[PDB]
């Protein structure tokens, strides 16, 4: 706790100007699905049905605005796609929020895994068991709808990915910053969103391509990029509740560096990972002849990239992490670690 106390003292009241993160990934553009407002209306009507407290749901909706995040993740999807994707994001955020006792966690995760199995499994049952908790009950219709837009191959991937995320959650002095990063890479719930691009754009990437070293690398780099940008962006929010296991903070503690230096390091890491990810593209098994196949490969990688850029763009466009007034019109964010 000496470590934590020192971290708090060093961080506290510091204001750091952060450059536009999107600039760090110049090749990858940020776009918005045209129907976000209309879909939001559907989502608002849908939210009333969901068994989570009205104030919590509104807080998520006003601060989070997950339909917008989905619109950013999948800007080119047909409008009909938007509802299920928006709904899933609401589920994942609600679910994470409710789970945050230990027994409660084991029970919810088991119930959640069961739902994932019932919905995405070989013998599909979309009916929630009676008395399902709200975060569980809501999931069944969403998985059924997503499955409807997915091939069995895409469905299998989604199922494993959802299991992996739920299990990671169940299985969660200061940790080494590198150790923290790796846990997040294994732990993070981004992958289901990448697979969801297949739903959004109604296509299936072949497993042989998905398992290719270059594709596996692009998925990994994009996962790393999303985590790294999240670390900086969420720093103010996390520090304020004294959640000191944030990578910027860990670098301060581990290397005895200033908060400014640690953020700079993370920014450099982003550039490094962006560069690796871009380099990986040449290595992909592009078809000499197949336009549809190459289109599928292109779409799939764009989905991964959007996970990184979109997460940052959405962060710059909602109030989950900081007051928007903290952002200038060059998209430069002034973090304030006043607590
Ligand atoms: C975990 C979660 C809700 C994932 C939803 C899907 C997803 C991968 C969204 C983008 C990445 C992200 C915001 C991760 C959360 O980081 P964090 O766990 O440090 O939480 P923070 O958003 O408060 O920083
Ligand atoms: Mg975070």
From Swiss-Prot:
Its cofactor is Mg(2+). The 2 conserved active-site motifs D(D/E)XX(D/E) and NSE are required for coordinating the divalent metal ions that stabilize the PPi moiety of the substrate. The C-terminal WxxxxxRY motif is frequently found in terpene synthases and is important to guide product formation. A motif (D(D/E)XX(D/E) motif) lies at residues 96-100. This is Terpene cyclase 6. A motif (NSE motif) lies at residues 230-238. Homodimer. SUPFAM superfamilies: Terpenoid synthases (SSF48576). GO terms for molecular function: (-)-E-beta-caryophyllene synthase activity; alpha-humulene synthase activity; metal ion binding. Mg(2+) 2 binds at residue 96. Mg(2+) 3 binds at residues 230, 234. Gene3D superfamilies: Farnesyl Diphosphate Synthase. Belongs to the terpene synthase family. Disulfide bonds: none annotated. Disruption phenotype: Abolishes the production of koraiol. It comes from the Eukaryota. It catalyses: (2E,6E)-farnesyl diphosphate + H2O = trichobrasilenol + diphosphate; (2E,6E)-farnesyl diphosphate = alpha-humulene + diphosphate; (2E,6E)-farnesyl diphosphate = (-)-(E)-beta-caryophyllene + diphosphate; (2E,6E)-farnesyl diphosphate = (E)-2-epi-beta-caryophyllene + diphosphate. Its EC number is 4.2.3.-, 4.2.3.104, 4.2.3.137, 4.2.3.157. Pathway: Sesquiterpene biosynthesis. Keywords: Lyase, Magnesium, Metal-binding. Terpene cyclase that is able to convert FPP into a mixture of sesquiterpene hydrocarbons and alcohols. The main product is trichobrasilenol. Additionally, side products include alpha-humulene, caryophyllene, 2-epi-caryophyllene, african-3-ene, african-1-ene, isoafricanol and pristinol. Does not accept GPP, GGPP, and GFPP as substrates. (2E,6E)-farnesyl diphosphate binds at residues 320-321. Binds 3 Mg(2+) ions per monomer. It holds the Pfam family Terpene_syn_C_2. It is an enzyme of class 4 (lyase). Mg(2+) 1 binds at residue 96.
